Paper text:
Each of these enzymes catalyzes as their main activity the cyclization of N-γ-acetyl-L-2,4-diaminobutyric acid (N-γ-ADABA), the reaction product of the 2,4-diaminobutyrate acetyltransferase (EctA), to ectoine with the concomitant release of a water molecule. We demonstrate here for the first time that the ectoine synthase is a metal-dependent enzyme, with iron as the most likely physiologically relevant co-factor. The EctC protein forms a dimer in solution and our structural analysis identifies it as a member of the cupin superfamily. The two crystal structures that we report here for the (Sa)EctC protein (with resolutions of 1.2 Å and 2.0 Å, respectively), and data derived from extensive site-directed mutagenesis experiments targeting evolutionarily highly conserved residues within the extended EctC protein family, provide a first view into the architecture of the catalytic core of the ectoine synthase.
The second crystal structure of the (Sa)EctC protein was solved at a resolution of 2.0 Å and contained four molecules of the protein in the asymmetric unit of which protomer A comprised amino acid Met-1 to Gly-121 and adopts a closed conformation. We therefore cannot exclude that this crystal structure does not represent the fully closed state of the ectoine synthase; consequently, we tentatively termed it the “semi-closed” (Sa)EctC structure. In the “semi-closed” structure, a longer carboxy-terminal tail is visible in the electron density, folding into a small helix (α-II) that closes the active site of the (Sa)EctC protein. The formation of this α-II helix induces a reorientation and shift of a long unstructured loop (as observed in the “open” structure) connecting β4 and β6, resulting in the formation of the stable β-strand β5 as observed in the “semi-closed”state of the (Sa)EctC protein. In the “semi-closed” crystal structure, (Sa)EctC has crystallized as a dimer of dimers within the asymmetric unit. This dimer is composed of two monomers arranged in a head-to-tail orientation and is stabilized via strong interactions mediated by two antiparallel β-strands, β-strand β1 (sequence 1MIVRN5) from monomer A and β-strand β8 from monomer B (sequence 82GVMYAL87). In the “semi-closed” structure of (Sa)EctC, each of the four monomers in the asymmetric unit contains a relative strong electron density positioned within the cupin barrel. Only the refinement of Fe2+ resulted in a visibly improved electron density, however with a low degree of occupancy. This possible iron molecule is bound via interactions with Glu-57, Tyr-85 and His-93. Since both the refinement and the distance did not clearly identify an iron molecule, we decided to conservatively place a water molecule at this position. However, in the “semi-closed” (Sa)EctC structure where the carboxy-terminal loop is largely resolved, a long stretched electron density feature was detected in the predicted active site of the enzyme; it remained visible after crystallographic refinement.
Numbering used by the authors:
A (entry chain B): 1 to 113
B (entry chain A): 1 to 121
Amino acid sequence: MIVRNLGDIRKTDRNVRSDGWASARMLLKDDGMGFSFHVTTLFAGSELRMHYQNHLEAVLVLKGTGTIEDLATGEVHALRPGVMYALDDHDRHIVRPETDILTACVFNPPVTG
Amino acid sequence: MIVRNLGDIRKTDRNVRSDGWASARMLLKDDGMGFSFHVTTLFAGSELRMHYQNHLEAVLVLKGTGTIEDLATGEVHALRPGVMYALDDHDRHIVRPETDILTACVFNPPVTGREVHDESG
């Protein structure tokens, strides 16, 4: 049984920070679950151009609002709590957070990092 | 790209109900991600005794408080928002929600039919 908590994780090197986002890795490849599990913050007013060549991702919006754009079609979908999007086709997409957006993210294969 | 909505799903047959909990299936086996993805309410006052022989489950607590007990040792861990537990050893465990607890759950392999529903309380 593994038990961790966000507060403690954000005080370690399993919390990664970058330009436009921060991600707290609750689980990584080493934990052996066969997926990684992340709590990722997307910063208000960012333009996050994303594309996961090497993973499938699922994202559940926990807090905040914005939009995600599917570049295959240009369709824009609203993001609000309870919206779930899955990048099943290694989709190129663009997230524009209006407020900060808090997400729970699942990656397969696991981020191993 | 798949885009779903928790609030719409809660109104459908994909919101699975048992004594002690109501679990929304957001991602299904057939979505081909290699895991299933759920939002589950565990009801205040419950005692949920669970053990998955054939699935690894990770759980992030989104709202509410209670405890989880690891029955290998009897250790009791606090559940509150931000706590993540992973059942990496097919652990036998007991969740006791103080208030309603809301979770985001991941199963590997994906949940399908009825095996983890029955293994849950």
